[model samples]
Target: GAMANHFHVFVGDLSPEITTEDIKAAFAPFGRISDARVVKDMATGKSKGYGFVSFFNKWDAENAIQQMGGQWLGGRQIRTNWATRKPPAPKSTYESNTKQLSYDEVVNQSSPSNCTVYCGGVTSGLTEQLMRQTFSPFGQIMEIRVFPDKGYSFVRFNSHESAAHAIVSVNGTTIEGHVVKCYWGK
Candidate 1:
């Protein structure tokens, strides 16, 4: 089915005084409305400046679109269109992340003169152990400190070589659903 019978209209630039009943009244001329709603903020309990309008018949929805789209409602010109569902965001992985480091490249990169690295955009799940696990394969991890709220991480390796390897391998890489920037730490 074309989903015409059950149609969704995206309305925007709403006046704060508008309500669901007002929306129903505006579309009543085209056909019977199944539902009308004005999205609101939960905290402030105020209009979010937008709403959805659904009609029982597809033809009615189309009629409403033709007549009401770009027509002024309340104090603003209402913008109406067929609503499309947005796709779900893809899950991120270290391998799927942007700016990836191949194992071969990590192997060939230069050794670190210092043993510490700074990490950015680190998410909550990137724990010290997880960082260790990710970097340990390249070299021994001496210490790992992850500041979850700050969205940053610090990793200290036993040797400069290990730190250098990690920087090349994971800098500008994704970890735990977030892309993290890695660099030599001061």
Candidate 2:
């Protein structure tokens, strides 16, 4: 039963330059391998630093994990485990939910003073200058950073009071026709 074929071992902490052949070279000793694949970016063609290797026998796949984990593979200590079939959910969606935006000041701010407010639920095509003007009415904002890759921005205020005031006033205000989640950001 332990020797049944068809299993996948998740390999992680791999060097970006590591390839599928590199994965096989380190794992083939355990047993017969079906395939070794390294997850890479389709657009940039860069390694994602993780992948799955398929083995024919169940015991062989399990044995590979014990031997490969914490062992130097392709110039880095690799971590191995049973590959999860179900994909992980997108993180941006979880943070976009306004209710998750907390206001317990002490817990949110990493700096000595809370000068930045996490701005979420913002629409696409937003710029720093636009974000600056939008929130400037509530406080003296020091800077505004817009993430082009994701839907969100952070407004850095001059003082704690200004940051707090912006959150209190604009927590649920409409920005670009969508409700914004304004809370103290770390």
Candidate 3:
């Protein structure tokens, strides 16, 4: 299963008069759209010349990128990629995440030696201590690092069993109002 389903498009050379339907029409053929939001400034309520589209599956999401991404939307090339759902966390000189545990190298290791559990849709108010407290009981939590924006981060464990255990154990685990997602972080 894929944790990232949303796509962010950087629309350049846009027509200001274009409506939401025009934007929707550009992507409808790809798949079911969960939602589309064109972000605007609070002061003027104008298109930031960028927008986001969410899909039901990774295939459809990728299809949008293949077809329309980098293609002109309103005569602008739309650069597309997975949204900033899991922003990178800040690094401290004392902390080293990659070296903390052995990473799984297999492309499809159903039972990986090490699993990176991604916790996204994390609540803004969420804390590392609470997350550790919540997941520690399931098994040994090798490390926990919530991303900089509190949107998402990675957790590593000694073994796949420990990782899978945390996935099953945590549900409705929200940081602010967003639901948590746990998966095999290959």
Candidate 4:
């Protein structure tokens, strides 16, 4: 499936001190906000320095980008772009199913070098820690990300071994009574 929404980014040589909200505030001059979130680490609990800024539609996103890309947000220049499809890559052990590890180059590089797992029908209020706890017992988790507004998520593992395990263990499962759907992510 495709993302139902779009985004704008005001990115630049950030000082690593800028917070995600600082970025959001820069775009506030435009319009209404459907959602806004910064992807932080489950382990470290810090912003990754850059994040997606969302508005109601492509118009707002585009306007924010055009008006704010070169402008300073939290005192740093911001760049902009549309969010793209980010299917997680399969790990080396899982790569036999494919021929290369180009998912990062082709997908999102921040993701694990392994299999992508899309977890849906997730509990309405699930958080990053909750998702991590649910899947940690099986093996090392490469990455776990939740879409704050959409009530869904994507989890990538360190190896195909773990991905397969989660597929049988977590897929078709439930959390807080929601019948969750899990499929080969992307």
lDDT of 3 at 107: 20
Q: What does the lDDT come to for candidate 3?
A: 0.62
lDDT of 2 by residue, 88-160 (tens): 5566655454653244542344454768988887876578987789789878999898874676899999987
In model 1, residue pairs whose N, Cα or C atoms come closer than 3 Å (at least 3 residues apart or on different chains), thus clashing, are: 4-58
| C-alpha TM-scores of all predictions | 0.40, 0.40, 0.37, 0.38
- lDDT (tens digit, per residue) of candidate 1 on 24-83: 898888856888888876665456678988778777777887888777777777777777
lDDT of 4 by residue, 59-111 (tens): 67777767765666545665566564334676776434553334333234223
lDDT at residue 86 of model 4 (Cα atoms): 31
The lDDT ranking, best first, is: 2, 1, 4, 3
Give residue 33's error in model 2 in angstroms.
Answer: 0.8
For residue 180, model 3's alpha carbon misses the true position, in angstroms, by 1.4
Model 1: weakest 10-residue lDDT segment is: 103-112
- Count clashing residue pairs per candidate: 1, 1, 3, 7
Q: Given candidate 4, what's the lDDT at residue 10?
A: 36
Where model 4 places Cα greater than 4 Å from the true spot, the runs are 1-114
Q: Compared with the true structure, what per-residue lDDT tens digits does model 3 show for residues 1-186? A: 354645443333334544455666777787556665566555655556666766666666667767875776754565566664446567786745443223242223455665677777775756677668777887788888886485776777767777877665553455556777665564
- Candidate 2, overall lDDT? 0.76
